[PDB]
């Protein structure tokens, strides 16, 4: 019950690492806004799991990286917080949603560079900007990056550019928000099982597994357990940091 | 009670961050070996705090940085674990102890013998402690090296000390890879300026200058660092290895 009476928004928590994160924040007593783009069935399943486990959650639909995205998300978020608490306080923001076998550098288009940046860097910035209006002293901003910002993979150049921009939001906003006691940190996963069809193919899972020093792919919960710790009071002396949650991928 | 049934060694836990760390590991249920070099009263005060908070601990005396240091520490550690548990299993090693001089030493004044003493205690001893500790450590164990933000922040009067924390961080990198097949994680936690109870922290003028290094404009409390070390010692940190964990209160924002 480390997060009793707190309110959290996990972007992209219908599926994958965001679902695992929403589930773990709710187990600690947070009221969780489960945000999704279009998969309402998956959002409703995250909420149902949280409720079955004795916590509280509600879904929020908003496609990010289009005109009106932040306003749409905050309309749903504040309505659901106000109905359940009488307040619109936001304690915890997890910028988890993203666009993700990559694109060879020669094949990347301007349209692809714009979509990746819209969703993966621009929307996170604008969500931080809006979220702090509601955020009390002692709040938490957690940006989900990627170990690819430290590990060269040409076919992930477009994606990795956006995660490099995301990490700058961590650096510069940690300094900006320090006076308010709001921390801002990056958590960087390695290859992580998000329930994608590729994780049902043992051959490919075994090749992907070799990337980790533990010679297994990450589970969504392995990353979500680290996010959950950063969301708690005991992380208060960590800000502006790169938190490696990759199972030793950057060791080689 | 995340560490029920676990045994931990915190080097240099008579005082400062190591005291705070031993106290927090014991509150999670670990049996804690409270290691010190010379200040037996301070070690006994760490133990007494753990015992009154309902935990279990015992002191282990061993000067590090001298012949026989690892042997001496492991004789005391194994005797105390065996008496209390019937086993010598070491789940958690925190390499916290260090030669750590508030005064510092400007480069012109550093001696060959100061370079030796800092390296012996701060880099050599941690290396040899890891080598010995893993014999006793199960799959799922934890090695936590206490570094310093000075590996990323230039401070000429701490050059000799910072050399040794650069060497300590290499223990983290290379040993994380070596030990991953056994499921043992190895991580650096880097404090910034942290109140360790030393006389400098009783001088508000100086505390106010020191405070400016943190983005939060306060010095760290020993518990602010200890809370992070305690998390790394738990099961929920399993997917973190080989890492530099910044526990500096935003000192490294450049
Ligand atoms: N190996 C990995 O899985 C891996 C590795 C490194 C980093 N990461 C990072 O970890 C985070 C989670 O990854 P994941 O693998 O769990 O993702 P995922 O399984 O692809 O799930 C993506 C989530 O984000 C939402 N989302 C996607 N695009 C959106 C948009 N334009 N607007 C709004 N919401 C949108 C999805 O909503 P719908 O359900 O409605 O589609 C879903 O909830 C991302 O930041 C990713 O870059 C993942
Ligand atoms: N600002 C800070 O406080 C700060 C900043 C960055 C990093 N650190 C790091 O955090 C750790 C703890 O620092 P602290 O400030 O809490 O230290 P401290 O208050 O100076 O306490 C040092 C501890 O190490 C033990 N120790 C010293 N020399 C030893 C030796 N040769 N053999 C064995 N034990 C020895 C001491 O034992 P006795 O009590 O017996 O003397 C004591 O328990 C160190 O690794 C330090 O480098 C501290
Ligand atoms: C350290 O992080 C990695 C190391 C080796 C390979 C990969 C990664 C990734 O972090 C990573 C990622 O963040 C996201 C994706 C990948 C990787 C990755 O290889 C992909 O393959 C394609 C996917 C699943 O569509 C998106
Ligand atoms: C980020 O780490 C710092 C940033 C600014 C100033 C200091 C530090 C330290 O980490 C640090 C340290 O590791 C150890 C000491 C110092 C510092 C430090 O400034 C000292 O001043 C003297 C002391 C407390 O005996 C040894």
Q: Tokens 């030990």 appear where?
A: B179
Alpha helix locations (H) across B53-186?
Answer: 69-85, 112-119, 125-133, 159-179
Torsion sign, CA atoms B67, B71, B73, B76: negative
Chain A residue with Cα closest to B174:
A251
Which residues does chain A have within 8 Å of residue B180's beta carbon, measured at their own beta carbons?
213-214, 248, 251
Atom 26 of ligand 3, nearest CA residue: A100
Contact of A224 with A23, CB cutoff 8 Å: yes
Sign of the C-alpha dihedral computed for residues B95, B97, B101 and B106 taken in this order: negative
> Which of B239, B242, B243, B253 is the best substitution to test chain A (most A C-beta atoms within 10 A)?
B239
What is the SS3 assignment for B233?
helix
Number of neighbouring beta carbons within 10 Å of residue A11: 26
Please, is B144 exposed, middle or buried when counting C-beta atoms within 10 Å of its C-beta (0-12, 13-18, 19+)? buried
Report residue B139: phi and psi, to 5°: -55, 130
By annotation, the residues of B acting in catalysis are: 161
Contact between B39 and B15 under an 8 Å Cβ cutoff? The reply is yes
CA atoms of A22 and A28, how far apart (whole Å): 10
Instruction: List residues in chain B touching A: CB distance below 8 A.
Output: 173, 176-177, 180-181, 183, 215-217, 220, 224-225, 227-228, 230-231, 236-250, 252-254
Domains and CATH numbers, chain A: 7-245 (3.40.50.720)
Q: For residue B70, give the DSSP letter.
A: H
Q: Do A251 and B180 touch (CB under 8 A)?
A: yes
d(CA A81, CA B177): 45
- The alpha carbon of B143 is separated from its chain's Cα centroid by a whole number of angstroms, namely 10
- Answer whether A229 sits within 8 Å of B231, measured CB to CB: yes
Strand partners, B165: none
Phi, psi of A155 (to 5 degrees): -75, 0
Burial (CB count within 10 angstroms: exposed 0-12, middle 13-18, buried 19+), residue A160: buried
Task: Give me the residue label for tokens 């996010």.
Answer: A227
The size of the A-B interface in CB pairs under 8 A is 101
Tell me how far apart the alpha carbons of residues A45 and A23 are, in angstroms, rounded to a whole number.
Answer: 11
Ligand 1 atom nearest A193 alpha carbon: 3
Elucidation technique: X-ray
Q: In angstroms, how far is CA A63 from the centroid of its own chain?
A: 15
DSSP B33-57: EEEESS-HHHHHHHHHHHHHTT-EE
Quote the distance between the C-alpha of residue A182 and its chain's center: 17
DSSP state of A136: P
CA A29 from chain centre, in angstroms, equals 19
- Cβ neighbours of B131 (radius 10 Å): 11
What is the Rg, in whole angstroms, of the alpha carbon atoms belonging to chain B? 17
> Any idea what DSSP says for residue A179?
G
Task: Tell me the C-alpha to C-alpha distance, in Å, between residue B222 and each of A100, A158, B195, B198, B244.
Answer: 41, 42, 6, 12, 18
| Distances from the Cα of A216 to the Cα of A212, A241, B182, B208, angstroms | 6, 25, 13, 48
Chain-centroid distance of CA B171 in Å reads 14
Residue A116 known to be catalytic: no
- Ligand 2 midpoint to CA A32 (Å): 41
Nearest to A223 by CA among A144, A167, A160: A144
């Amino acid at each position: 019950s480390r997060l009793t009476g707190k309110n959290a928004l996990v972007t992209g928590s219908s599926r994958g690492i965001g679902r695992a994160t929403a589930v773990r924040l709710a187990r600690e007593g947070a009221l969780v806004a489960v945000h999704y783009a279009s998969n309402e069935a998956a959002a409703d399943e995250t909420v149902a799991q949280i409720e079955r486990e004795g916590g509280r959650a509600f879904p929020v639909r908003a496609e990010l990286g289009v005109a009106g995205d932040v306003h749409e998300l905050f309309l749903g978020l504040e309505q659901g917080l106000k109905e359940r608490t009488g307040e619109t306080t936001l304690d915890i923001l997890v910028n988890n949603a993203a666009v993700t076998d990559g694109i060879l550098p020669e094949d990347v288009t301007a349209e692809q560079l714009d979509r990746y940046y819209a969703v993966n860097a621009k929307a996170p910035f604008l969500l931080v900007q809006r979220a702090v209006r509601n955020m009390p002293d002692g709040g938490r901003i957690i940006n989900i990056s990627s170990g690819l910002t430290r590990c060269a993979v040409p076919e992930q150049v477009a994606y990795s550019m956006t995660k490099g921009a995301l990490e700058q939001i961590t650096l510069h906003m940690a300094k900006h928000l320090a006076p308010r006691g709001i921390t801002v940190n990056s958590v960087a996963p390695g290859i992580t099982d998000n329930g994608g069809a590729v994780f049902d193919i043992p051959e490919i899972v075994e090749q992907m597994a070799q990337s980790s020093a533990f010679k297994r792919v990450g589970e969504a919960g392995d990353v979500a357990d680290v996010v959950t710790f950063i969301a708690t009071d005991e992380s208060r002396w960590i800000t502006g940091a790169f938190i490696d949650a990759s199972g030793g991928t950057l060791l080689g």
